[PDB]
Amino acid sequence: RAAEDPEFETFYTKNILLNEGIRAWMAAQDQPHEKLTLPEEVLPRGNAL
Amino acid sequence: GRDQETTGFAWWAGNARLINLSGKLLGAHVAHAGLIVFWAGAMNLFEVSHFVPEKPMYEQGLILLPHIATLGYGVGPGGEVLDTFPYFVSGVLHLISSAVLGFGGVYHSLIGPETLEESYPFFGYVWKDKNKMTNILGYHLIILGCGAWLLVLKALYFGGVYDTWAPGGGDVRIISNPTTNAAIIFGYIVKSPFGGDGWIVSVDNLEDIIGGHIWIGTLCILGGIWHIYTTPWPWARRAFVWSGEAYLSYSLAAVSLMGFTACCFAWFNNTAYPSEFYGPTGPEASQAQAFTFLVRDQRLGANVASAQGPTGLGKYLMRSPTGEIIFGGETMRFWDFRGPWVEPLRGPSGLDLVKLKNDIQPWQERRAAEYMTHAPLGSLNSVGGVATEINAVNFVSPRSWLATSHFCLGFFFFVGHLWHAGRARAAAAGFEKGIDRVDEPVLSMRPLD
Amino acid sequence: LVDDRMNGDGTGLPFGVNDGILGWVIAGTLGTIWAIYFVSQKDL
Amino acid sequence: ENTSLWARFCEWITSTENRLYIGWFGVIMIPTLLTAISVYIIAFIAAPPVDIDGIREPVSGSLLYGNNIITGAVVPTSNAIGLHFYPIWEAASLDEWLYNGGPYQLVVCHFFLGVCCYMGREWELSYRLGMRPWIAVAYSAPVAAATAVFIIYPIGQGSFSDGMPLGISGTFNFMIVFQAEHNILMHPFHMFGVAGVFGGSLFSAMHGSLVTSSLIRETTENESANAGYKFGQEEETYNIVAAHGYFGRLIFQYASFNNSRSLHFFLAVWPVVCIWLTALGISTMAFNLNGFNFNQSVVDSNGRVLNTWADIINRANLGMEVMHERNAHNFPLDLA
Amino acid sequence: MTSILQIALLGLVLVSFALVVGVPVVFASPNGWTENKGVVFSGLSVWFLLVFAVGVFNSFA
Amino acid sequence: SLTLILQLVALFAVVAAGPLVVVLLSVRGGNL
Amino acid sequence: MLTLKIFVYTVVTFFVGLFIFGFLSNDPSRNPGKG
Amino acid sequence: EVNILGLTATALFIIIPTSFLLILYVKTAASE
Amino acid sequence: KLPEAYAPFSPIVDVLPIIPVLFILLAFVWQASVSFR
Amino acid sequence: MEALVYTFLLIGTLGIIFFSIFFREPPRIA
Amino acid sequence: LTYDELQGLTYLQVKGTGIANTCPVVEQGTSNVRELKPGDYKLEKFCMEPTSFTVKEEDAKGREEFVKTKLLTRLTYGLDGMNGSMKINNDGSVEFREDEGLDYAATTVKLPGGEYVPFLFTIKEFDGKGTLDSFSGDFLVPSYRGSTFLDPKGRGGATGYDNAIALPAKADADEIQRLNNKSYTPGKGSAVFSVAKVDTETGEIAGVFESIQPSDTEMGAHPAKDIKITGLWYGQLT
Amino acid sequence: VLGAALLCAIHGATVENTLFEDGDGANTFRAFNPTQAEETYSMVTANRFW
Ligand code: CLA
Ligand code: CLA
Ligand code: CLA
Ligand code: CLA
Ligand SMILES: CCCCCCCCCCCCCCCCCC(=O)OC[C@H](CO)OC(=O)CCCCCCCCCCCCCCCCC
Ligand SMILES: CC1=C(/C=C/C(C)=C/C=C/C(C)=C/C=C/C=C(C)/C=C/C=C(C)/C=C/C2=C(C)CCCC2(C)C)C(C)(C)CCC1
Ligand SMILES: CC1=C(/C=C/C(C)=C/C=C/C(C)=C/C=C/C=C(C)/C=C/C=C(C)/C=C/C2=C(C)CCCC2(C)C)C(C)(C)CCC1
Ligand SMILES: CC1=C(/C=C/C(C)=C\C=CC(/C)=C/C=C/C=C(C)/C=C/C=C(C)/C=C/C2=C(C)CCCC2(C)C)C(C)(C)CCC1
Ligand code: OEX
Ligand SMILES: [Cl-]
Ligand SMILES: [Cl-]
Ligand SMILES: [Fe+2]
Ligand code: NA
């Protein structure tokens, strides 16, 4: 529904977006075996923060 | 003292053992008052000894030196400290008075008269004597009215109290013509507690502050005389429980309401709590972020009135729910913030675009220490701003400290009011210890189904 | 404006009233309850 | 007392013969909570999308607008409103009131009044039954927590949009954002609350085990062992003498809980005081007192940052921080 | 004049320390307050004298 | 530092003052 | 919409008046205990 | 449209245990 | 800072806030000494 | 249907708790 | 209220009353309109507030009708603080040209049936040609959202995902309208103005307007409707 | 877990608020006797209250 609708948002979609940021910004310093040297621009950001 | 086998109270309820002991109760009170004045003097001397003069009086974790500084004792025009001798004098006077009070409390607790009625009928009191309790309440009401009139005298004749709303960024301003309008004062007390008004946290000027203090002092003195020369009416007798525990619960509820109310003053008020002494409030530094970024991005060259954000509402300026022009960021919740560095920039309709473009003042620009750090974030073990900040700056806002602590103690005192009100009602009814087990009320009632 | 609004949010209205009818119905309801209680107090 | 209107009303209100006790606290509990129940149910079923963040980006939260029970939620009030008391009569239309988040304010205000009067009604029934009155004092802890998450935290942050959404996924959203911005896990009051619920479950299991185990035979492998005697005798079953011996032999037989009253007082006081502590931790983090901040506390002799579990928590927190309100921020430092 | 103030304040500190240690001890002693009345009164008198002395010496130092 | 030494000695003097009163009342009679 | 405010104000004033005058109407005497 | 698998699963998970419990309650209340 | 005539007494001042915390603990010492009767 | 099943389950739970409150078995032995 | 008594009110008196969203009026002026002195003018404080918000939806049977709607956003729809030029000639020809100000307002309105219609009420970059009785022209309409706006799934334009992140097996030639395009191309709208109640002593004109402009296309997913905005405008000539 | 903590708090408060008299002192904790064969709290009163 949210893929075919740019208007449909729920708190569950907000939680999914938060989980994506947790994974992306936590993996590099969380799993040193993975050697995730991800640059800052491919990491997801909101606006201004 | 006494043991549990005679009083019926255990050690963790030992202060109940002196409920009916007037002299020991008075000694506990006087010793506790000595404790309060001792904390005042000791913490004042600690804050004076730990005072760096070049820094403002909020990066140092000082909470009560701002309380003296609000009265105008040793405060320069812009907000500088000038001298710390009034603070030192206040601390030393509190320490000596606490020594006297502690001696009196220790004396009355240890070797004072055990019970006051047999030798001192003026001070003796039973908890069921409504006339005597109203006499004591009247004495304390007259004392509190004199205390409020003391602040009135300091504001009116002794050249004190610091005004943030004075032009240029505040000044210690002697207050002339306080607003003693009953309509204004009681419209303050009966209005809504929400964001549009604020019930008691709405005083934007020392004139209304001192008019309300005149009203509260006169009313307290008159009510004290009234309680001295009256006895509670039969409706009050039928409504209230007349015991020492019930009176404590009434005081606990009132003082918990006062604690929550003072927490709200601390978080929102910037008139009785100047920003130069207490740091920014919640709404400011957030309004200051939008204001400073607006003036910076128009100093670069980009216009701020026709600039829209990612959502199309305005990166710098937008409209409030009412048609006032407000700051366009996420600080649209704080559009009711009134500050000394905002009002000359603010007009009848909105934020006065022409004033933002041309009539900005250099002192309002320099008031970016409001925004920079010092937004009332700060974490429990100090460190900087938001919870994800690193160990760079040692700061937590004094407004945050004495709002958080005061809400905690206000809620605890509401809980204590509940406890003491319930136990006082059970004591007056007769079942504070439990159920009589041979005639319980439940067996005399019809079953529910 | 495109619609009619109460426009009473804010402005420090006493007890939230913006018309005299609200204060009058508050006073009338409180007075009615007080009158019933007064003529019907003390159980009997 | 019998031929008077306010009399008959008073001894009907204070009557203990009602199926549910009303009382003078109930005359305020019942209408506010019924209003909150009605508005919450109607909003959860058919609430139109509401712009929570004040950025003209509504979220649905209601079943008829395409979500389930887990992800459906009565969404908080608009950020544009703030804590400015927006009821129906302050709106020009019901559609506008619904678009701005008025149902949340209505339900939260009525729920706060209703739980306060529920506590008062608990006291009132304890008073009218000849009981002791501190069940309301025990109930004051969930009321404090609900007030902290629905009223006090929006007061501290300046907007009812900061209130906990009336739902499940909204509750998780409130949790994650609160973590990102206050570091609740590293807050000692929250540690006390977590220890309180864990110890409450522990002590509930221990008390249930000790009272369910310490029995003499009165119920056989059938429904009941009434062959000794049927219903209608005061010869009591149970035990607390061998149960205390078992609990003592369990560890070292000196932590004496032989007093049943002291044991039940401990069972009452531990989760209550811990939930008091965690509710006040939420209330302190409302004014941004926040949790422990040990980011880059460990440095070596040359001053290089040695990583830390607290630093990993910081990375997760800032990853949460950059996701929250992707479109609601225009300025770098998050203060409002 | 500052040295006189410092000596007076140190004397006041020691007198207050002696008073804090002894006043509860004298009060709660069995049959001790009516026999230590003179020494307790003298201690309180010197305490008040030292307080007033530091107060009047503050204006000169 | 000498400042820290005087802070410690003042701290020990004020911390030990209370228990000194209690033990003095315990060994010099009673009424506590 | 003003009449909705009038109706709600009347309802709230009614219930608050019932609360206050009911607690005024001899509440400490509504006990089974002797006292 | 219509998730008929979810509908059948939910309807069966409601009907079968509720009917089982209701039958047990009816046969228990019939013979005291 | 404290005035110049009171600067040596600032280390004594630095300990004075904790005395009220010491007072309730003194009460607990007295209860222990009376054996919590 | 999607929302109809959720509404039916919620009102069924509410009806169950209503029956448990009001049409319960009367309590016996204490 | 005219501009004279709006400046005579404090901020606290106007606050919370809805007065700040109302454009000033002219009470001492004349309705002759043509009496206005010709020349080159630089008007400031150009006010523009609406009185109705009607949306054009096309039925699937072939006729044109507008419908009245219900506003969801509160009093944020006025335009205030704009300025520009008016080259008025002796015959009456004008050269109205707005330059800068609060020349936009994000407005969300509700159609009958419960469909949300967001739009950006703009008059920015508008030129005016015609007489004093009626002059019209065209103005620039921005998208509604910037290219840094992220959808509920994090996809966007300048920044975003541009891919269905929820499921790794759906990016084919059916989500192109939702993922690949992400258009922010500005539209244009047409507004017609009219000058009434001219003032001679201080050059204060306050007429009416009727504006036609496209609605929001969200992110380019669906075509925009047409919004008709009618109301009053106000200006001071110097 | 939340229901277990709720049950612990409610059970403790209910037992402590239905404790019967069992004595004359103001401290109910010493009113308890493990030797007696009677229940220390009123289950009937607790059931009617809840
Ligand atoms: C604000 C704190 C405070 C205060 C002012 C008091 C005051 C009092 N309590 Mg109490 N108490 C407290 C806290 C407090 N308590 C706490 C927290 C507990 C729980 C542990 C108790 C438990 C308790 C019990 C069980 C009893 C009291 C009793 C008493 C009364 C008489 C004590 C007595 O006769 O024995 C004498 C005590 C002493 C000799 C030791 C105290 C030493 C002195 C007084 C203080 C320390 C020295 C001090 C610095 C001197 C100042 C010097 C001066 C020159 C400035 C007294 C009025 C008794 C009572 O109720 O009366 C019937 C009683 O039995 N209390
Ligand atoms: C007319 C008799 C009288 C007076 C004047 C007082 C006065 C006072 N009592 Mg007291 N009391 C009385 C009778 C009286 N009481 C009786 C009969 C009892 C029963 C035994 C008590 C029991 C009692 C207790 C238990 C306590 C007090 C306390 C206090 C003080 C509280 C004020 C405070 O500390 O805050 C601050 C003070 C102010 C804000 C006032 C500012 C100073 C002003 C300018 C001075 C007022 C002068 C004024 C003209 C004189 C008043 C006229 C008088 C006739 C009322 C205060 C000085 C408390 C205490 O111990 O405090 C140390 C306390 O705990 N009283
Ligand atoms: C209204 C109460 C209040 C408030 C708002 C403040 C605020 C402040 N104080 Mg202060 N203080 C207070 C009371 C208060 N204090 C009291 C009563 C004392 C006497 C002991 C002191 C003594 C004191 C000193 C010596 C110093 C401060 C300092 C400070 C500043 C920094 C505080 C800090 O470092 O972290 C705050 C510390 C904490 C948050 C510790 C938390 C303690 C909690 C409440 C324990 C309770 C948790 C839980 C319930 C435990 C249960 C166990 C229990 C059953 C025993 C700050 C502005 C420092 C300063 O900057 O100097 C100017 C400083 O050095 N204070
Ligand atoms: C000025 C307010 C006030 C006053 C005068 C009293 C007075 C009294 N209370 Mg009471 N109480 C209050 C507030 C007050 N209370 C509050 C706010 C609460 C809620 C927390 C309670 C809860 C309470 C209970 C449960 C009981 C009393 C009891 C009593 C009586 C005996 C007290 C005693 O000797 O215990 C001894 C004192 C102690 C053992 C010290 C207490 C240690 C506390 C619990 C730890 C916290 C202290 C720590 C330094 C602070 C940390 C920070 C904080 C913000 C958490 C006595 C007449 C008893 C009673 O009912 O007798 C009739 C009793 O059972 N009170
Ligand atoms: C808009 C401004 C907002 C701010 C103004 C707010 C004003 C609030 C004033 C309330 C003060 C009343 C205190 C009584 C407390 C209970 C006394 C009681 O238990 O009372 C019981 C007691 C028992 O004997 O009796 C008695 O002592 C009788 C004494 C009670 C006095 C009765 C009040 C006057 C009655 C007027 C009737 C109103 C009639 C209806 C008006 C209709 C208008 C159209
Ligand atoms: C009864 C009782 C109690 C209580 C007690 C108390 C409360 C006490 C107190 C007391 C007090 C309340 C005290 C106080 C004090 C004070 C003092 C003693 C002082 C002083 C002085 C000095 C000496 C100073 C000096 C200085 C100066 C002047 C300045 C500079 C610095 C210095 C510091 C040097 C208890 C709980 C135990 C238990 C029960 C019984
Ligand atoms: C100073 C100041 C001011 C002023 C203030 C004021 C003026 C206040 C007040 C106030 C008031 C004027 C108050 C009053 C009150 C009262 C109360 C608070 C009460 C009560 C009570 C109760 C709660 C009751 C209960 C009950 C009932 C209900 C019935 C039966 C009986 C009983 C008891 C149960 C101002 C702000 C201006 C400025 C600043 C400062
Ligand atoms: C101003 C000043 C002063 C004053 C002072 C005072 C005001 C006093 C005091 C004092 C005090 C106030 C002291 C104290 C101390 C205390 C302590 C040291 C404590 C303790 C406790 C504990 C350690 C506990 C233990 C325990 C128990 C027994 C119970 C249970 C278990 C436990 C383990 C917890 C002087 C004269 C020096 C001079 C200089 C300055
Ligand atoms: O809205 Mn919910 O939340 Ca208290 O932070 Mn700033 O703003 Mn928003 O951000 Mn993170
Ligand atoms: Cl922002
Ligand atoms: Cl979010
Ligand atoms: Fe049990
Ligand atoms: Na963002």
Author numbering:
A (entry chain d): 304 to 352
B (entry chain c): 13 to 461
C (entry chain w): 60 to 103
D (entry chain a): 9 to 344
E (entry chain z): 1 to 61
F (entry chain v), H (entry chain m): 2 to 33
G (entry chain i): 1 to 35
I (entry chain k): 10 to 46
Task: Give sentences from the paper.
From these four complexes, the photosystem II (PSII) complex catalyses light-driven water oxidation and provides the electrons used for carbon fixation. PSII is a homodimer with a molecular mass of ~500 kDa, each monomer contains cofactors such as chlorophylls (Chls), quinones, carotenoids, and lipids which are coordinated by at least 20 protein subunits. The eukaryotic reaction centre is a dimer surrounded by tightly bound monomeric light-harvesting complexes (LHCs) and trimeric LHCII complexes. In this work, PSII was isolated from the halotolerant green alga Dunaliella salina.
The second, stretched conformer was solved to 2.62 Å resolution and accounted for about 37% of the unstacked C2S2 PSII particles. In the C2S2STR conformation, the PSII monomers slid in the membrane plane along the central symmetry axis separating them. Core subunits at the centre of the monomer displayed a greater shift (D1, D2, CP47 CP43, and PsbO were displaced by 6–10 Å), and the peripheral subunits showed the largest shift and tilt compared to C2S2COMP (PsbE, PsbP, and CP26 moved by 13 Å, PsbZ showed the largest relocation of nearly 15 Å, and CP26 showed a maximal tilt of 16°). (d) The stretched PSII conformation shows substantial drop in the membrane plane (13–15 Å, depending on the precise location), contributing to a larger inward curve (compared to the luminal space) of the entire supercomplex. In C2S2STR CP29, helices A and C move towards the LHCII trimer of the opposite monomer and away from CP47, with helix B of CP29 serving as a rotation axis. Several CP29 Chl molecules in C2S2STR are positioned close to light-harvesting complex II (LHCII) and can mediate faster excitation energy transfer (EET) from LHCII to photosystem II (PSII), whereas in C2S2COMP CP29 is positioned closer to CP47 and moves away from LHCII. In the C2S2STR conformation, CP29 stromal Chl 612 and Chl 611 are located 16 and 22 Å, respectively, from LHCII M1 Chl 608, while CP29 luminal Chl 613 is located 20 Å from LHCII M1 Chl 605, and CP29 Chl 604 is positioned 23 Å from both LHCII M1 Chl 604 and Chl b 605. Overall, we find that CP29 and LHCII move closer to each other and away from CP47 in the stretched configuration. In contrast to this, the average distances between CP29 Chls 604 and 612 to LHCII Chls 604 and 608 increased from 20 Å in the stretched conformation to 23 Å in the compact conformation, suggesting that transfer from LHCII to CP29 is slower in the compact orientation. Substantial displacements of approximately 13 Å are observed between the two monomers in the compact conformation, and a larger range of displacements (up to 20 Å) exists in the stretched conformation.
